[PDB]
């Protein structure tokens, strides 16, 4: 018998979702039976709901849609920081919240996971600022309301929220019969882009996170490969293009950019900015020089043609229509590439040498995931090899995000080897999903930067203050504690450059096990970029 | 120079707060220096902010006030489920949120921990339904607004929220010169006195709002003097001294012990103090508490024989019960030994053993699951306390909460009963427990997944399974040797008795006790309760 629950799961299938994350509770168990029963969809239960929301976000970055299931009140409020991060960085995540029967809600009963005030609407209201759309389903409205909020997910690629009462999930439904000025405005915009690109001596394309949101990376890469246009990205939307393309210049990060890149971008006679938002961590704390007078910018929500706002266009089809532009070919030069061989010594591992080694040793078909801290500042500038991706969260910047997110992205694409760089202080927030990693038998390479506390915080304020210290776990021993054998997870401790090179190669050569690699770094050691960034953060926070 | 931050910390000191929980971020480090500097207050840094909010709640249950510190956006939104629990069960917790400089907020800058829309007010608005009061401080308003929201905390004993911009924390202030903070009261007291005077078989019921205000000792003095029959719900368990001769046990609707159920439901007058009737605390609304013969008093409102009353002071009204003369119950109460074998541990025998072996001045903390349903009916010894969260019911709460409460009172031995499934949500505060060298006795019910969920729906469904960790190996992984944390695995009744006594006899180390129970085994109460939850969700 086909139910409202089955209608919702059919629509999630249509979005490309093959795994649902989350945590059970009595208000969602009956719905959960319908996930278990489906051949085309797998329940992947998390230890906690914050982790589920991070994991769904990571999944969405790779699969280009995601869903997780929570219980009313305690589940959804545990996950709201993850949904806020999906809203900030524009990932298409559906949160399903199982709620009490409409009878219990209508009677205002003082049931578990409420404030005992008979009000079942507080928690949906609290989601208003971090959802593109939200609904409390009834038997009557269910199929239309499901389709309205998932259509908002398709239009905006921002998160949405479905409150699913137990009885409403179980109610009868019918399978969907339909799939989930502007065009003239789209054409005027395309014509102006074509004309600016035709006439430009030194154009620069800048792509950002909204390209990733819509799954447009391969479209951008096809566009840049055919046209030979110079391209840069911010660290917000890193891997929005294939970084191995010859016209990829590197990561523009305001005054912290490599000088040749900085000179090229800031001297360009035309800027085409696609899906970019300029944030403190992505602009060297607002030290960028991007002249709007010589810019066409396109975003999901709005655009700017040489400083004139435009509103009525379709972002996705406009980007796709760049592949139709004829008579576009850049004939000029790019910038110097000087990549050195990394030659290890027995020297103690240092931040600058670590990121040199990672850049040298990364392979094609990898996804690099980097946590806020030394890892993001060290890894974000690295040139990726072909067929590769990057996950980082520089705008929301929620530490711990990257561990469940890496696992969710790894589940989304089994054929991309995930390399996670996470700090000791960040791993402590989300460590419990090591249980899920073991159960799912996924094989990411996980590097823990053990520098005895919060080095990025030490670099901003209070380098010797006790609040920057954390309890030192035995990080390499965690897999065994969480139930792994050496047949599943290989643990390592690394102290030297020689060890780092040996262990990274060993891990990459063994795609059939998860690697759990504890890196020992000095608490005083920060990558060259973070040395400068820490003082710019402190200035931004000057009292 | 004395700052707005110093003003806030002086007011928190006045509330009896000696420890501040939370997680640093760039938006709060400069304020945090002021906590470090204070001789009278300790920074106790958590692994994550949800755990900090749970730990502050547990601290508030024992200390009767608490505070924790988060960073703007990512910290505060991580903690909002803990603050919602503190709102639901009425605990006086202050959340301090360090935010960007007013210059950055005023300029609408696209900075980290925002939605890059220049709006710095979304997250404070999202707290409106789960706070008694909230404020965004300015240099101008700081001292008035700090005093306003902490006054709300004193009046309501509900959580409050202070957004503290970097520059506003650092701004000049002057030390406070005084510390912070009728006919209806008398009418209520007169009607209570008259009903108690005339009653043949009165019952007093106390609940969680007594705990909120720290009125347990007042209620205990009132019951000891009057000899009045008293029960509590499992929501507000330990709102009275359970060792008092007139304490009947826990009333839980039709799941009550029969002698207690018969007594409560035949009482000719009911006095409810600080009670809320919730599904988990009434045997899923199978209580029989005739409002025609009831006076109920709550923080926000009262009922005199089904008539609402509004304008009274809950705290002083409870205190004024000690003045009632010509109250002495002259009637009877109800009728109220563990021999272990080598038999495998079962749920029912476990909770019989815990009741037998618990000692005076212990705090029992019990997680939603077999632990709460098993432990909540247990008769406590003198000077004992209980923490459970049956209304909000957020699994994982109890591990950080037990550590918070243990920090709040180092002289009460904390016994935590937490399920395998619940421990997985909040396990990282084992690091804090090791660092702080606190000595709670932690029992982990390893029954290979979510037994309470199996008892409600889908006992054989894979969603009720969890990854089996090596629970006994966690303390070593998190940096404890046996000098700090003693790890044990228990399978038999004889092992359980030996290990619980050994833990109680060693107050100088933390115990980490893995209990092996069958996934199919549930306490007597939960066998019945599970089907009542399932019926409440009947589609
Ligand atoms: C949820 C959350 N809480 C707090 C912060 C503030 N924060 C920014 S980076 C950081 C420290 C990260 O330390 P670690 O992961 O050890 O990195 P590293 O030592 O390599 O810099 C903290 C606490 C945050 N960004 N997110
Ligand atoms: C934060 C949160 N997520 C989900 C739930 C739903 N829930 C209630 S009890 C429970 C399982 C508890 O399992 P465990 O701790 O193993 O207890 P036991 O097996 O002894 O019953 C779950 C998932 C909840 N109450 N809180
Ligand atoms: Mg670190
Ligand atoms: Mg269990």
State whether A370 and A512 are in the same domain: yes
- Contact (Cβ atoms closer than 8 angstroms) between residue A400 and residue A426: yes
Concerning whether B465 is annotated as a catalytic residue, the answer is: no
The nearest alpha carbon in chain B to A276 belongs to B116
Q: Evaluate whether residue B336 is within a structural domain.
A: no
Residues with CB under 6 A from ligand 1: A 371-375, 397-399, 423-426, 449, 451, 454-457; B 23-25, 71, 74-75, 78
Please list, in sequence order, all residues whose beta carbon lies within 8 angstroms of the beta carbon of residue A392, skipping any fewer than 6 positions away: A235, A236, A238, A369, A370, A372, A376, A379, A380, A402
State whether A99 and A197 are in the same domain: no
Host H or E run for residue B16: none
Helix (H, G, I), strand (E, B) or coil at B516: strand
Of the candidates A141, A170, A199, which is a domain's last residue? A170
Method of determination? X-ray
Residues of B in contact with A110 (CB under 8 A): 276-279, 391
- Contact (Cβ atoms closer than 8 angstroms) between residue B153 and residue B135: no
Among left, alpha and beta (phi > 0; psi -120 to 50; other), residue A470 is: beta
State whether A205 and A163 are in the same domain: no
* Tokens 């605990």, residue located: B91
List residues bridging with B387 in a β-sheet: B365
Q: Evaluate whether residue A329 is within a structural domain.
A: no
Of the candidates A137, A170, A203, which is a domain's last residue? A170
C-beta atoms of B278 and A111 within 8 A: yes
- Residue B26 CA: which ligand 1 atom is closest? 6
The CB-based long-range contact list for A195-202 (8 Å cut-off, 24+ gap) reads A196/A270, A196/A272, A196/A296, A197/A227, A197/A229, A197/A270, A197/A272, A197/A325, A197/A328, A198/A327, A198/A328, A199/A270, A200/A268, A200/A269, A200/A270, A201/A269, A201/A332, A202/A230, A202/A264, A202/A267, A202/A268, A202/A269, A202/A270, A202/A332
Residue numbers in the known binding site of A for Mg(2+) are: 424, 451, 453
Handedness of CA A414, A22, B71, B37 (dihedral sign): negative
Buried/exposed code over A104-125 (b: 16+ C-beta within 10 A; e: otherwise): bbeeebbbbbbbbeeebebbbe
C-beta atoms of A461 and B29 within 8 A: yes
State whether A401 and A517 are in the same domain: yes
**Which of A74, A123, A209 best tests the B interface by mutation, with the highest count of B CBs <10 A?**
A74
List residues bridging with B71 in a β-sheet: B98
Residues with CB under 6 A from ligand 2: A 23-25, 71, 74-75, 78; B 367-371, 393-395, 419-422, 445, 447, 450-453
Please list, in sequence order, all residues whose beta carbon lies within 8 angstroms of the beta carbon of residue A343, skipping any fewer than 6 positions away: none
Q: Evaluate whether residue B408 is within a structural domain.
A: yes
Concerning whether A359 is annotated as a catalytic residue, the answer is: no
- Whichever domain contains A78, its CATH number is 3.40.50.970
Task: Please tell me the distance from the alpha carbon of residue A270 to that of residue B319, in angstroms, as a whole number.
Answer: 76
State whether B311 and B352 are in the same domain: no
- Contact (Cβ atoms closer than 8 angstroms) between residue B62 and residue B405: yes
Q: How far is the CA of B57 from the centre of ligand 4 (A)?
A: 23
C-beta atoms of B114 and A88 within 8 A: yes
The structure was resolved to a resolution in Å of 1.8
State whether B145 and B10 are in the same domain: yes
State whether B423 and B455 are in the same domain: yes
Of the candidates A127, A143, A170, which is a domain's last residue? A170
Task: Please tell me the distance from the alpha carbon of residue B479 to that of residue B485, in angstroms, as a whole number.
Answer: 10
From the candidates A13, A112, A289, A461, give the one annotated as an active-site residue. A112
State whether A87 and A190 are in the same domain: no
- Contact (Cβ atoms closer than 8 angstroms) between residue B29 and residue A457: yes
State whether B374 and B310 are in the same domain: no
- Contact (Cβ atoms closer than 8 angstroms) between residue A329 and residue A379: no
Q: Tell me which residue range forms the domain holding A109.
A: 4-170
C-beta atoms of B116 and A395 within 8 A: yes
Q: How far is the CA of A140 from the centre of ligand 4 (A)?
A: 38
Residue nearest to atom 11 of ligand 2 (CA): B450
- Whichever domain contains A190, its CATH number is 3.40.50.1220
Task: Please tell me the distance from the alpha carbon of residue A11 to that of residue A405, in angstroms, as a whole number.
Answer: 23
In this complex, which of A78, A465, A542 lies closest to B33 when CB atoms are compared? A465
* Tokens 């905390």, residue located: B153
- Contact (Cβ atoms closer than 8 angstroms) between residue A362 and residue A421: no
Q: Evaluate whether residue B255 is within a structural domain.
A: yes
- Residue A526 CA: which ligand 1 atom is closest? 21
CA of A252 vs chain B CAs: smallest distance (Å): 17
Residues of B in contact with A477 (CB under 8 A): 476-477
Give chain A's domain count. 3
Concerning whether A127 is annotated as a catalytic residue, the answer is: no
C-beta atoms of A467 and B425 within 8 A: no
Residue numbers in the known binding site of B for Mg(2+) are: 420, 447, 449
Please list, in sequence order, all residues whose beta carbon lies within 8 angstroms of the beta carbon of residue B333, skipping any fewer than 6 positions away: B229, B245, B246, B248, B263
The nearest alpha carbon in chain A to B422 belongs to A47
- Residue A74 CA: which ligand 2 atom is closest? 1
Q: Evaluate whether residue A331 is within a structural domain.
A: no
C-beta atoms of A396 and B73 within 8 A: yes
**Which of B167, B285, B398, B425 best tests the A interface by mutation, with the highest count of A CBs <10 A?**
B425
Please list, in sequence order, all residues whose beta carbon lies within 8 angstroms of the beta carbon of residue B76, skipping any fewer than 6 positions away: B49, B70, B95, B97, B123, B127, B161
State whether A386 and A437 are in the same domain: yes
Concerning whether A336 is annotated as a catalytic residue, the answer is: no
Q: Evaluate whether residue A176 is within a structural domain.
A: no
Task: Please tell me the distance from the alpha carbon of residue B501 to that of residue A494, in angstroms, as a whole number.
Answer: 43
Q: How far is the CA of B84 from the centre of ligand 3 (A)?
A: 30
CA A302 to chain CA centroid, Å, is 22
State whether A373 and A455 are in the same domain: yes
Concerning whether A85 is annotated as a catalytic residue, the answer is: no
In this complex, which of B26, B101, B458 lies closest to A29 when CB atoms are compared? B458
Residue nearest to atom 3 of ligand 2 (CA): A75
Buried/exposed code over A415-453 (b: 16+ C-beta within 10 A; e: otherwise): ebbbbbbbbbbbbbbbbbbbbbbbbbebbbbbbbbbbbb
Q: Which two tokens stand for residue A458?
A: 């030490």
Task: Please tell me the distance from the alpha carbon of residue A482 to that of residue A438, in angstroms, as a whole number.
Answer: 8
Tell me phi and psi for residue B315, to 5 degrees: -55, -55
> Computed over its alpha carbons, how large is the radius of gyration of chain A?
24
Task: Please tell me the distance from the alpha carbon of residue A34 to that of residue A7, in angstroms, as a whole number.
Answer: 11
Concerning whether B420 is annotated as a catalytic residue, the answer is: yes
Concerning whether B393 is annotated as a catalytic residue, the answer is: yes
Residue numbers in the known binding site of B for thiamine diphosphate are: 370, 393, 395, 421-422, 447, 451-452
- Contact (Cβ atoms closer than 8 angstroms) between residue B262 and residue B243: no
The nearest alpha carbon in chain B to A3 belongs to B539
Residue nearest to atom 13 of ligand 2 (CA): B450
Task: Please tell me the distance from the alpha carbon of residue B223 to that of residue B200, in angstroms, as a whole number.
Answer: 16
Concerning whether A457 is annotated as a catalytic residue, the answer is: yes
CA of B197 vs chain A CAs: smallest distance (Å): 33
- Residue B466 CA: which ligand 2 atom is closest? 16
Inter-CA distances, B520 with A468, B448, B449, Å: 45, 10, 10
C-beta atoms of B80 and A542 within 8 A: no
Q: Evaluate whether residue A175 is within a structural domain.
A: no
Q: Evaluate whether residue A346 is within a structural domain.
A: no
From the candidates A22, A85, A453, A534, give the one annotated as an active-site residue. A453
Q: Which two tokens stand for residue A60?
A: 């969405």
Q: Which two tokens stand for residue A421?
A: 């760089």
CA of A462 vs chain B CAs: smallest distance (Å): 7
Give the A:B interface size as CB pairs under 8 Å: 280
- Residue A113 CA: which ligand 2 atom is closest? 25
**Which of A41, A50, A81 best tests the B interface by mutation, with the highest count of B CBs <10 A?**
A81
Concerning whether B307 is annotated as a catalytic residue, the answer is: no
> Computed over its alpha carbons, how large is the radius of gyration of chain B?
24
**Which of A33, A34, A35, A48 best tests the B interface by mutation, with the highest count of B CBs <10 A?**
A48
State whether A65 and A136 are in the same domain: yes
Q: How far is the CA of B452 from the centre of ligand 4 (A)?
A: 7
Ligand 1: residue of A78, A398, A399, A452 to mutate (most ligand atoms within 8 A of CB) is A399
Task: Please tell me the distance from the alpha carbon of residue A275 to that of residue A208, in angstroms, as a whole number.
Answer: 5
Task: Please tell me the distance from the alpha carbon of residue B502 to that of residue B482, in angstroms, as a whole number.
Answer: 14
Task: Please tell me the distance from the alpha carbon of residue A124 to that of residue A136, in angstroms, as a whole number.
Answer: 8
Task: Please tell me the distance from the alpha carbon of residue A372 to that of residue A394, in angstroms, as a whole number.
Answer: 7
């Amino acid at each position: 018998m086909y139910t409202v629950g089955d209608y919702l799961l059919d629509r999630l299938h249509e979005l490309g979702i093959e795994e649902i994350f989350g945590v059970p509770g009595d208000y969602n168990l009956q719905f959960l039976d319908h996930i278990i029963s489906r051949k085309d969809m797998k329940w992947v239960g998390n230890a906690n709901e914050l982790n589920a929301s991070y994991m769904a976000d990571g999944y969405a970055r790779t699969k280009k849609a995601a869903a997780f299931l929570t219980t009313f009140g305690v589940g959804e409020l545990s996950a709201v920081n993850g949904l806020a991060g999906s809203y900030a960085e524009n990932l298409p995540v559906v949160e399903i919240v199982g709620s009490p029967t409409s009878k219990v809600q209508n009677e205002g009963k003082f049931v578990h996971h409420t404030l005992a005030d008979g009000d079942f609407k507080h928690f949906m209201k609290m989601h208003e600022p971090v959802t593109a759309a939200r609904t409390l389903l009834t038997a009557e409205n269910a199929t239309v309301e499901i389709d309205r909020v998932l259509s908002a997910l398709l239009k905006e690629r921002k998160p949405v929220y479905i409150n699913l009462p137990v009885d409403v999930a179980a109610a009868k439904a019918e399978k969907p019969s339909l799939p989930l000025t502007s065009n003239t405005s789209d054409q005027e915009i395309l014509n102006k882009i074509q004309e600016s690109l035709k006439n430009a001596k030194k154009p620069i394309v800048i792509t950002g996170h909204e390209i990733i949101s819509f799954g447009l990376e391969k479209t951008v890469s096809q566009f840049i490969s055919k046209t030979k246009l110079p391209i840069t990205t911010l660290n917000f939307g890193k891997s929005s293009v294939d970084e191995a393309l010859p016209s990829f210049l590197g990561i523009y990060n305001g005054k912290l950019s490599e000088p040749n890149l900085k000179e090229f971008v800031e001297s360009a006679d035309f800027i085409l900015m696609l899906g970019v938002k300029l944030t403190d961590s992505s602009t060297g704390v607002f030290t960028h020089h991007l002249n709007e007078n010589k810019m066409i910018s396109l975003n999901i929500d709005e655009g700017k043609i040489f400083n004139e706002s435009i509103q009525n266009f379709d972002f996705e089809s406009l980007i796709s229509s760049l592949l139709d532009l004829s008579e576009i070919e850049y004939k000029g030069k790019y910038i110097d590439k000087k990549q050195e061989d990394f030659v290890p010594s027995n020297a103690l591992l240092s931040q600058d040498r670590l990121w040199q080694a990672v850049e040298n040793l990364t392979q094609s078909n990898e996804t690099i995931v980097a946590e806020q801290g030394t890892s993001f500042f060290g890894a974000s500038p690295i040139f990726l090899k072909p067929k590769s991706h990057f996950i980082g969260q520089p705008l929301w910047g929620s530490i711990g995000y990257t561990f469940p997110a890496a696992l969710g992205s790894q589940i989304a694409d089994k054929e991309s080897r995930h390399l996670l760089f996470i700090g000791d202080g960040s791993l402590q927030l989300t460590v419990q999903e090591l249980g899920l990693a073991i159960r799912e038998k996924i094989n990411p390479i996980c590097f823990i930067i053990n520098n005895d506390g919060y080095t990025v915080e030490r670099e901003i304020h209070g380098p010797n203050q006790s609040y920057n210290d954390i309890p030192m776990w035995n990080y390499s021993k965690l897999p065994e504690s969480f139930g792994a054998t050496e047949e599943r997870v290989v643990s390592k401790i690394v102290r030297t450059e020689n060890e780092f090179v040996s262990v990274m190669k060993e891990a990459q050569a063994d795609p059939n096990r998860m690697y759990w690699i504890e890196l020992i770094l000095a608490k005083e050691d920060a990558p060259k970029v973070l040395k400068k960034m820490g003082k710019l953060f402190a200035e931004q926070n000057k009292s």
